[PDB]
Amino acid sequence: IIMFEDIFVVDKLDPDGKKFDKVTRVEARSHNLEMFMHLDVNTEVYPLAVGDKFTLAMAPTLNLDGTPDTLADKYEYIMHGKLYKISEKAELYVSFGGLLMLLQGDPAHISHFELDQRLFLLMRKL
Template identity: 65%
Template sequence: MAEHLFEDIFHVTRIDPDGKKFDRVNRIEARSEQLEMYMQLDIATDVYPMHMGDKFTMVLAPTLNLDGTPDTGYYTQAGRKTLADKYDYVMHGKLYKISEDNSSKDKGPTKVYDFSEL
């Protein structure tokens, strides 16, 4: 079984706090239950709409393979079970930047995970 690097339940506290930036995408702000972590996340709302007060589970895993073997860098849904089958919405990719932002006293400790360094 693949291990999880991080798992927590988040509550959506705000949607598009700085105004809508993209069509079919909302930027949500959420706070986790266990670690009281603050997160901003861009969600493809035409695929997975989210609303104020919604709860969701966020999981970071090193691989989608259920046996824990590393990903090959190529993903296909070709008839095999993966960790993605356990969730309604999955973002698959690499983390390019992880940083801490503790400048906001009202939000508490914040980790910034960046999937999108294009």
């Protein structure tokens, strides 16, 4: 059910602020896959410091074996969005209700993603 799953380590923060009361864009590089990721995360409700390691997973549906549109107990930062731009080392542009995500990796790593489809975002900081 999970299409892409890898451990990511953050590199730097765009605002670099602890109490800016603003959405923070993070830059995390994939391990053993060499993939760069942009993601807008809320630090106040989900703290993320530099050097932390977190897993990431993407699935079309949260149900087991079908029923598109019970993985909630495993992860803690579930999101929902759609992929609108696929043109690039291919990269993906997924917006979770205005929160842009840029997953830039290799053409072979990302090949089973269609255009204008709904996908989730499973995250856990170990």
